[PDB]
């Protein structure tokens, strides 16, 4: 099969254009600029963010998990994308941490 | 718990700087430019790609799945990032499809 009914964890994708602050590749909190100019034309800084809808879609944790043997929950993974960030007075072009998916994490039961 | 042993699907993150062709936001195959200049300073176009290590990490499908009730496999999700492209003529700063995570998809058993 290819087309599934649902994933183990439910995702929520939102196009974000109102970004003001973000955590950089290292961990430093950087100021995000709303616009980016590509020599001749200007573009509004848009970011595709996908996060977890709920940490426990099922009482046991993730959907379709062997509950009697596994401790599970839904966590949000990250991606690193270049963004026009303002550092004090000068504009920089460096990677920033962004929510990109909702995955399930396992742990053995006692 | 927070820190898990392993996810339901195994991921593999690779920093890609050798991108020549990519699928755009609609589906059109576009030519990706190797460098991007900020009017004076130049930057090599780097993309953070995360894909599936294997579709079936476990014989049944994904790890820690209720095999007797669910049909499962690991699929690669996508993200959309702005990249300096060229549709044969000139510069185009438009969104492109990129591998970003490895998730598990479920299906009910007969």
């Amino acid at each position, epitope marked *: 099969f290819h087309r*599934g009914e649902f994933s183990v964890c439910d*995702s*929520v*994708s939102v196009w974000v*254009g109102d970004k003001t602050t973000a955590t950089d590749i290292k961990g430093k909190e950087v100021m995000v600029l709303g616009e980016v100019n590509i020599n001749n034309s200007v573009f509004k800084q848009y970011f595709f963010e996908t996060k977890c*809808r709920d940490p426990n879609p099922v009482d046991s944790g993730c959907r379709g998990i062997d509950s009697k043997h596994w401790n599970s929950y839904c966590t949000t993974t990250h991606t690193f994308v270049k963004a026009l960030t303002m550092d004090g007075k000068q504009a920089a072009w460096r990677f920033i941490r962004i929510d990109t998916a909702c995955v399930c994490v396992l742990s053995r039961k006692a | 718990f927070h820190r898990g042993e392993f996810s339901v699907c195994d991921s593999v993150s690779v920093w890609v700087g050798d991108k020549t062709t990519a699928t755009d936001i609609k589906g059109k195959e576009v030519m990706v430019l190797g460098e991007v200049n900020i009017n004076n300073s130049v930057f090599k176009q780097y993309f953070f790609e995360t894909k599936c290590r294997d579709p079936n990490p476990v014989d049944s499908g994904c790890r820690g799945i209720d095999s007797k009730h669910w049909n499962s496999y690991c699929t690669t999700t996508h993200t959309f990032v702005k990249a300096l492209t060229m549709d044969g003529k000139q510069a185009a700063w438009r969104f492109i499809r990129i591998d970003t995570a490895c998730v598990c*998809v479920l299906s009910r058993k007969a």
Partner: antibody, heavy 128, light 110 residues
Framework: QVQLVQSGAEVKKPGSSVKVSCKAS????????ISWVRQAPGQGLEWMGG????????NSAQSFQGRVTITADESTSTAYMELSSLRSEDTAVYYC?????????????????????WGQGTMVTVSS | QSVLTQPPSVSAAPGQKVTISCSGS????????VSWYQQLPGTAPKLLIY???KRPSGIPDRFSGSKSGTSATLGITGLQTGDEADYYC???????????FGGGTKLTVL
């Protein structure tokens, strides 16, 4: 601020096809996932389908037997709903809605969205 | 006939807590998220609750939402004349691959 402006109310004959418009007044039309829900006078809500203009990926209800043809144009910022072969039972108030949240966006899953902001509505009457 | 089972009419006195029930199966509520809609006479529906409990901006703290298995409930505290409207159910059905709505509940205030 962002409001969904629909087409004017129409009265059509059985067997015809009505095309209802849904323009997003303001901006960021491609961001949302335009939905379509109909409501017969003094009856419940019936989901028809939807489309994401940025991906041009659509979804329709199986109950309609492929009569609904949901289309979208980013340039004009308008989403259209065409219901071919009109029946007396199709006499309803046709609403269009938007959602900034797109659930289950996966190549192996059918992507869906809620109905956050609703349109004013378009009354379609089928005279018999 | 509607997929989601809702009571036809509900009556309550002003300034009192009132509940509206919702019924379904594993195909919808059991493996998804419930959303509530407020439809005033001669007005378009309005999003009241989303993701079982969450409420959007503008909606007061007076409106509550809770989900338990294949059933969901809406809670309206501190009742008023303005609340007199038709309340609908809404969730995604994985098997039908369509958004399913409830019958509708007529809220009447003296």
């Amino acid at each position: 601020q962002v409001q969904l402006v629909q087409s004017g109310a129409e009265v059509k004959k059985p067997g015809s096809s009505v095309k209802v418009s849904c323009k997003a007044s303001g901006g960021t039309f491609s961001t949302y996932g335009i939905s379509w829900v109909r409501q017969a006078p003094g009856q419940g809500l019936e989901w028809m389908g939807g489309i994401i203009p940025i991906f041009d990926t659509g979804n329709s209800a199986q109950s309609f037997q492929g009569r609904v043809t949901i289309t979208a144009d980013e340039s004009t910022s308008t989403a259209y709903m065409e219901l071919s072969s009109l029946r007396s039972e199709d006499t309803a108030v046709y609403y269009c809605a938007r959602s900034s949240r797109i659930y289950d966006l996966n190549p192996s899953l059918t992507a869906y969205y809620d109905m956050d902001v609703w349109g004013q509505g378009t009354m379609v009457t089928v005279s018999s | 006939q509607s997929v989601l089972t809702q009571p036809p009419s509900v009556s309550a006195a002003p300034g009192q807590k009132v509940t509206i029930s919702c019924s379904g199966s594993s195909s919808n509520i059991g493996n998804n998220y419930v959303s509530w809609y407020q439809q005033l006479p001669g007005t378009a529906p309005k999003l009241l609750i989303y993701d079982n409990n969450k409420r959007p901006s503008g909606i007061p703290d007076r409106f509550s939402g809770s989900k338990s298995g294949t059933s969901a409930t809406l809670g309206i505290t501190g009742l008023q004349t303005g609340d007199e409207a038709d309340y609908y159910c809404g969730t995604w059905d994985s098997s039908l691959s369509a958004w399913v709505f409830g019958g509708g509940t007529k809220l009447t205030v003296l």
